[PDB]
């Protein structure tokens, strides 16, 4: 599945997939060596769903990287929760 098909499957922009590959949040399953074409797989969609689930809670991207690459991060969800209530008061 090329990036155009994956961007329509995911309902997200292509530049979003380019950014997520650049930062290392969502890396394509196979990148064509000569062209550079990124190809994706169902196992990449299972991870973009997690990315979207966390990003809809207002987590910053780096917080999403820390949450999906390193487990036992319950202090980060508490930091985001406290910041959300503080922002609600404000």
């Amino acid at each position: 599945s090329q990036i155009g098909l994956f961007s329509k499957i995911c309902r997200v922009t292509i530049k979003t997939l380019h950014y997520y590959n650049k930062i290392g949040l969502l890396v394509p399953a196979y990148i064509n060596p000569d062209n550079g074409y990124r190809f994706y797989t169902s196992d990449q969609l299972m991870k973009f769903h997690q990315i979207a689930s966390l990003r809809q809670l207002g987590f910053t991207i780096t917080e999403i990287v820390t949450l999906t690459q390193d487990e036992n991060s319950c202090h980060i969800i508490e930091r985001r929760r406290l910041e959300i209530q503080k922002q609600i008061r404000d």
Partner: protein, 476 residues
């Protein structure tokens, strides 16, 4: 015979181009079959060298864990979904391993040939197959270049007989057993190279690794490579017969591009390059005619070369296409309105903002010749009216010199320190101006003291005693 009668290279090309007759639906098919048999022969001659198959199975176990996909390793099978390739790769691995141990010597020619004919089944992607054949070319050409450096040194010494230097060199392959027989004639030439008999070793003892790195004999490698050469010359002679038969198709397509900046033979040659690409990419097993596929590549090459080299100031392909789209929208709006549209409405029928379309309209113009006759005369041309705008006016040069003289005069009427830091702060009679810190360090003084000195010197020069010469060099 028409030889020597015309000067036109178009007529010469058409004349030599029409000496090849068109192919039938059946002629394209067996020319394509000749190409595929040449490439199959190259592959079955590659199969004799094992490390290429080892690299290919490396690629397959990389496809297993998806370091790559086999859609980039094989385009299909002949007697792509990834399940049949497992069967064929397993049966090929079971062949390579059952060939690896059987070494003897007549028995060694059964398994290599059956592995060749069972490796024939894989019709690879061009990239991997080209990598394998180029790898074998590099192996054989380094082996061959030390093979003829063996004779390079023998020419370095003296007169070179090698008519019978080859007699028992063939087959020994381990030691100087062939080398000792050369001095056995004791003709003077057989002297020379023998006192280089030690220096030759690291050539034919570098063979000491490579005959242990390839497994097969020197002429076995050389002759499977000459069979590769025969196969690729068969596939190349068959590609030449398919290009030469279809040049009328290129002229047929190229005649529709004739006045868009490129000349007719330029278009024909670019379409010929496209046609050669089409011959490389054509598949006759799809049942289509060669014209159907080749028209795409010929038109691609011609339109791409028009976008590349039809203009003096090259426009990129994206802007070339924006210009073309704007032009046909203008044609439609001129027909449906009887009036040439304005960029406002030309930007409403298109999807683009008006300021983008204004610069697209300003971007597409070809330069005028400066040999254009002005007045449609032949004595005055456009280049006669164009002025050098980079020239300094002689009154401006004379003003510059008078200003240099006047500032020299007023800087002579200051202290030596103040005039020095004021000629150093600015670039006056130096090649570079300086900062407060550089002037200060050259004086071993601070930045702020130099600032004070130059501010005081400027205040001195502000007085009308020292200013009336310089105030004349200013304007309203």
């Amino acid at each position: 015979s028409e030889i020597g009668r015309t000067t036109d290279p178009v007529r010469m090309y058409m004349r030599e181009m029409g000496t090849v007759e068109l192919l039938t639906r059946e002629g394209e098919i067996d020319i394509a079959k000749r190409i595929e048999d040449g490439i199959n022969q190259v592959q079955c001659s590659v199969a004799e060298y094992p490390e290429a198959i080892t690299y290919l199975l490396e690629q397959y176990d990389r496809v297993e864990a998806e370091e790559a996909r086999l859609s980039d390793l094989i385009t299909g099978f002949v007697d792509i979904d990834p399940e049949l390739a497992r069967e064929k790769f397993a049966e090929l691995r079971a062949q390579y391993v059952v060939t690896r141990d059987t070494i003897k010597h007549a028995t060694a020619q059964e398994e290599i040939l059956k592995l060749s004919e069972v490796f024939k089944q894989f019709r690879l992607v061009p990239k991997q197959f080209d990598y394998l054949v180029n790898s074998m070319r590099v192996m054989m050409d380094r082996v061959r270049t030390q093979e003829r450096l063996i004779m390079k040194l023998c020419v370095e010494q003296c007169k070179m007989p090698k008519k019978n230097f080859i007699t028992l060199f063939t087959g020994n392959e381990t030691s100087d057993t062939w080398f000792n027989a050369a001095i056995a004639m004791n003709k003077p030439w057989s002297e020379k190279l023998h006192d280089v008999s030690e220096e030759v070793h690291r050539a034919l003892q570098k063979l000491q690794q490579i005959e242990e790195e390839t497994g097969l004999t020197i002429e076995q490698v050389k002759d499977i490579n000459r069979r590769m050469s025969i196969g690729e010359a068969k596939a190349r002679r068959a590609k030449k017969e398919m290009v030469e038969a279809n040049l009328r198709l290129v002229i047929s397509i190229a005649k529709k591009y004739t006045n868009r900046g490129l000349q007719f033979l330029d278009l024909i040659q670019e379409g010929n390059i496209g046609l050669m690409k089409a011959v490389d990419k054509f598949e006759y097993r799809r049942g289509y005619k060669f014209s159907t596929y080749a028209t795409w590549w010929i038109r691609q090459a011609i339109t791409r070369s028009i976008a590349d080299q039809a203009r003096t100031i090259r426009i990129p392909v994206h802007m070339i296409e924006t210009i073309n789209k704007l032009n046909r929208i203008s044609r439609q709006m001129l027909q449906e309105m009887g009036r040439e549209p304005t960029p406002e409405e030309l930007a409403e029928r298109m999807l683009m903002p008006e300021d983008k379309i204004r610069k697209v309209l300003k971007i597409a113009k070809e330069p005028i010749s400066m040999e254009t006759p002005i007045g449609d005369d032949e004595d005055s041309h456009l280049g006669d009216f164009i002025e050098d705008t980079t020239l300094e006016l002689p009154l401006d040069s004379a003003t510059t010199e008078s200003l240099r003289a006047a500032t020299h005069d007023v800087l002579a009427g200051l202290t030596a320190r103040e005039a020095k830091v004021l000629r150093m702060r600015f670039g006056i009679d130096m090649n570079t101006d300086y900062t407060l810190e550089e002037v200060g360090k050259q004086f071993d003084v601070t930045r702020e003291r130099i600032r004070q000195i130059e501010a005081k010197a400027l205040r001195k020069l502000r007085h009308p005693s020292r200013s009336e010469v310089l105030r004349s060099f200013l304007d309203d």
